[PDB]
Amino acid sequence: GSHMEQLKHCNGILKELLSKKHAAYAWPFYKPVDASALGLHDYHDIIKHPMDLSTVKRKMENRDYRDAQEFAADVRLMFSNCYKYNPPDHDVAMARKLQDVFEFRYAKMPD
Ligand SMILES: Cc1cc2n3c(c[nH]c(=O)c13)CN(C(=O)c1cccc3ccccc13)c1ccc(CS(C)(=O)=O)cc1-2
């Protein structure tokens, strides 16, 4: 799915993921994780490919994505980073709220 058509759909997803309707659970993913400031010990040992929505937006604005799948890969990388580093009952609950938005809207892509 290399179409612009599909990439436009992904672009609508990103803007919805950055909208104020989801800010309550989404804003921890707006910018890169500041592990050193937040005392996230070993964060960059355990997480070798950081990702966040500011990075996904840059890549989308620079038209660096070749198809929707690369897009999805990055968004799921961001969520996976969160699940891998944190315990199951870490306030991870915000990631699953946002991922439910992303996944349902990704599944609705034309094709
Ligand atoms: C992907 C991600 C983002 C954060 N992460 C944390 C643990 N593991 C993660 O994967 C993770 C630790 N973290 C918190 O625990 C936290 C404390 C106080 C209020 C919160 C409200 C919502 C979510 C987290 C917090 C905070 C704190 C602040 C920032 C924003 S910034 C520019 O300063 O880096 C990011 C995270």
From Swiss-Prot:
Changing V33A: Abolished binding to histone H4 acetylated at 'Lys-12' (H4K12ac). Disulfide bonds: none annotated. Residues 5-109 form the Bromo domain. Changing L38A: Reduced binding to histone H4 acetylated at 'Lys-12' (H4K12ac). It is found in: Nucleus; Chromosome. Chromatin reader protein that specifically recognizes and binds histone H4 acetylated at 'Lys-5' and 'Lys-12' (H4K5ac and H4K12ac, respectively), thereby controlling gene expression and remodeling chromatin structures. Recruits transcription factors and coactivators to target gene sites, and activates RNA polymerase II machinery for transcriptional elongation. Belongs to the BET family. Homodimer. Interacts with E2F1. Interacts with (acetylated) STAT3; promoting STAT3 recruitment to chromatin. Interacts with CTCF; promoting BRD2 recruitment to chromatin. (Microbial infection) Interacts with herpes virus 8 protein LANA1. The first bromo domain specifically recognizes histone H4 acetylated at 'Lys-12' (H4K12ac). It also specifically binds histone H4 acetyl-methylated at 'Lys-5' and 'Lys-12' (H4K5acme and H4K12acme, respectively). The second bromo domain recognizes and binds histone H4 acetylated at 'Lys-5' and 'Lys-12' (H4K5ac and H4K12ac, respectively). Some specific inhibitors of BRD2 that prevent binding to acetylated histone are promising therapeutic molecules for the treatment of cancers or inflammatory diseases. ABBV-744, a small molecule, has been tested on tumors with success: ABBV-744 antiproliferative activity is mainly restricted to cell lines of acute myeloid leukaemia and prostate cancer and is able to displace BRD4 from chromatin. GSK046 (iBET-BD2), which specifically inhibits the second bromo domain, is a promising therapeutic small molecule for the treatment of inflammatory and autoimmune diseases. This is Bromodomain-containing protein 2. The gene is BRD2. The chain holds residues 348 to 455 of 801 of the full protein.
